[PDB]
Amino acid sequence: SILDPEVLKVAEYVYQERLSKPYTEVGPEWEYNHKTPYATRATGTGHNLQRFITIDDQRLHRPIHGLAHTMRTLFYSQLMYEAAKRQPHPHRCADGRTIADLSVQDLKKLNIAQLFFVAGRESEASYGDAYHRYHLYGAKQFEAYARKHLTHLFSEKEIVLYSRCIEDRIGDRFDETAEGYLIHLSHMIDLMRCKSPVEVFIGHSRGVSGIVPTLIQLFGREDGLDIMHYARSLFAATGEAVPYISSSEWPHLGIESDRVERALKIVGSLEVEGQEADAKKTAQAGFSVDGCYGALVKIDTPDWYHQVK
Amino acid sequence: GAMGSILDPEVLKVAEYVYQERLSKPYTEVGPEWEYNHKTPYATRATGTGHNLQRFITIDDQRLHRPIHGLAHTMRTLFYSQLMYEAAKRQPHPHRCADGRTIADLSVQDLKKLNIAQLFFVAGRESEASYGDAYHRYHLYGAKQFEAYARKHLTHLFSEKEIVLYSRCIEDRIGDRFDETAEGYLIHLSHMIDLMRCKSPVEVFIGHSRGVSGIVPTLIQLFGREDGLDIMHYARSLFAATGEAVPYISSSEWPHLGIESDRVERALKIVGSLEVEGQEADAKKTAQAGFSVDGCYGALVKIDTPDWYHQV
Amino acid sequence: GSILDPEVLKVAEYVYQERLSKPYTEVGPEWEYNHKTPYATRATGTGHNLQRFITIDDQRLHRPIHGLAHTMRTLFYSQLMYEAAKRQPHPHRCADGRTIADLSVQDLKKLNIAQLFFVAGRESEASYGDAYHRYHLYGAKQFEAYARKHLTHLFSEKEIVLYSRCIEDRIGDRFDETAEGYLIHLSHMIDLMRCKSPVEVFIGHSRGVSGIVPTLIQLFGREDGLDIMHYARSLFAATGEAVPYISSSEWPHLGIESDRVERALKIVGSLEVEGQEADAKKTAQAGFSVDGCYGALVKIDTPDWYHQVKEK
């Protein structure tokens, strides 16, 4: 519910230098046509999607991956820190540790690293090769900023760790590291703003579990759905459309009755109505750190959440 | 403020053993052959009162044996030692024990070994009897149960000299002091703290006699008034999390307890005034904390600590 | 042939390695019971030392009465009784309002899993009250902990609580408190034919109680009922156990009223099957591995009317 003021200083720099900047890998050089897949600089779709919106003749660049998206993930990691500490058997990562092993100081550093997580993006390109390049860019920006301003806070091995977290390196598991796990999970929660019911509730494949089943399996239905409703309220606080949910429709989405019944068993019946986007709240979230943070601190957190610092 | 999962899988595996092998079983020194009267001291095989107190309680048709010295009581003491491990690090000159060490000299490994030992501390009980001879028999039973388990399953973690030392902590032989070793000191303190669930205001705040300090005053003089009081409130909150009655506190009532103005006044400048309301017992939470390690642990990891537990 | 879900067999493997293959621990001299000296040992009843293990080809097979072969047989019984309830106009209505036919093919899998744990908490063959309820509460909590960590993707939390309470068989829950518990209890009851007398199997103890197969007749009729009876007897045989002879002729000579043996021959009809005696290596192969136990049981033909649903 609260963020350290030094986290917000780094937030201000990241907004000015990156999250407010236009996408550059845009335009005709970066259109994609799958039958001539190498005719351009793009080798997959998405470079020209929602490059910006205009709110009251101000231009808001990278609206899907801007200040508000980035700051919401920092509230997600602070909440899931407490949720993980309420579990008897928090998930153990490939490094031997759980989210409950992170200190209150570790979560400050992790918040700083989340500021850079998508800061290296140059379009909304989605395909694998663009994704790993943009994350490399974010990781390099993080290393540079931290090694110059944040050595009083980050040791050298922590800079390497959190940069490897931002990089999302080829061959690292989702849960390679407790730090990187909490970071991927915070990013995952925010995908609810724009993914289909199938991705949010059923999992896009037979193996995959889906965003909300993942929260329920990690924190139980009670805490997990608390978190899902809290993120949905963070959407609204920052003007984004809040999708409706209807577990009635899931049997009609094209998925084998197999995966649907499993998804309804995990999640339970859910019928909650949507909300519409709001241009003014969008603009206050997107254009200033003070604007975004002030809209986010005033949203109530779950009853069980008692933030430490 | 949740403390979170602080005990590693190895410690929980031991806790499952201690529950399955000892803390879940009926007390056995309990029938007519263990009643007692000081006026026919050796009519039965008991030599003091208490063998038939609180053998079990029934909660929603489930029978919970040894509710006073069961799983919930044992687990809570592991949480107190973790909290007091941090508190001793906020202290200039923590107490130096007969081994020449303090609580602040404990490593994270020592705390893990100590937690394992605490799992057995009262696991050798065969009744609620706490008169001299039954007390020392039951703690020696606990020590031997710990030695048997450790020598078969924990030799990659306890050296042979460590199994002897921790066994000695559990035994609590006559002649042994509170503070022979830093580890045992901490074990005794965690046990002491849980006594607030069932002891009178005089033992908790003023002291049994003119000599002994009493439970909360002992916390206060080891950790300061502020850390001390936080530990007290934390323990009280753990009673509620495992469904146990939490006694009220009324520092106003202490002159009206029939003990000298001498002793009562000193207890109110150490502790300061205190008015905290009690809370009844809860049977659902009591059963959930009593019949499984998962239920008891899951209930306890949730509970807030003071913020200073988290800062290092 | 009848089939089990691969995820049920995976849990069946876990339950063999972790419980069903482990020796009983409430055994030996400290659990022997002598009725003349009721307070001599830890036991408050008889049976702790009955049939701790048998020896096949100098291999020691622990808990042979309540091991892998009994447990897996009960899973096959509930599968068959599910379809058998599916064939009845007004199948029995349990205290929760549901019948066995109200369960889905997916519920049966969850029930199958819960059945694996039904006697897995036993620490001896003791069956007197206090021992029976401790053992079923052990098995219930061992189901809980396993489900809550490896099965949240298949069990809801309400479902875990429900199936745990079925395994627990709490005091004051009726045989038919839930449709789930009813099916679980009925499957255990079928397997008691392997070891109990003609009076329990056909006439009952008292004036109020039905026999084991008068019960299967009253629920599924006479053809469906005794079809189930013979399928069980045939699962005994495939798992090496002695198949007692049946003789309706002897039933008067049993020292119980013509009242009851009258009812039995009306309900069951006349019936006389010759017995068959046990087989060590069919007992050993059904006792020592999931693969050996499953492989033996899938090869027994099901009755004509049984068409099992499972494909996913």
Numbering used by the authors:
A (entry chain A): 3 to 311
B (entry chain C): -1 to 310
C (entry chain B): 2 to 313
Show the paper's wording.
Here, we describe identification of two bacterial effectors that reverse PR ubiquitination and are thus named deubiquitinases for PR ubiquitination (DUPs; DupA and DupB). Structural analyses revealed that DupA and SidE ubiquitin ligases harbor a highly homologous catalytic phosphodiesterase (PDE) domain. However, unlike SidE ubiquitin ligases, DupA displays increased affinity to PR-ubiquitinated substrates, which allows DupA to cleave PR ubiquitin from substrates.
The overall structure of DupA resembled the PDE domains of the SidE family ligases SdeA (Kalayil et al., 2018) and SidE (Wang et al., 2018) as well as the PDE domain of DupB (Akturk et al., 2018). The three catalytic residues from SdeA and DupB PDE domains were also highly conserved in the core of DupA (H67, E126, and H189), while several loop regions differed. Varying the length of the corresponding SdeA loop, deleting the loop regions from both SdeA and DupA PDE domains, or swapping the loop region did not affect the function of either PDE domains. In contrast, mutation of the three conserved catalytic residues from both DupA and DupB resulted in impaired cleavage activity. Moreover, after 5 min of reaction, we detected a labile and heat-sensitive His-Ub intermediate on the DupA His-189-Asn mutant, while wild-type (WT) DupA displayed heat-stable auto-PR ubiquitination , which was further cleaved by DupA at later time points. This suggests that, similar to the SdeA PDE domain, DupA utilizes a histidine-based intermediate reaction to catalyze the hydrolysis of ADPR-Ub (Kalayil et al., 2018). Thus, the PDE domains of SidEs and DupA/B may share the same catalytic residues to mediate opposite reactions: PR-Ub transfer to substrates and removal of PR-Ub from substrates (deubiquitination), respectively.
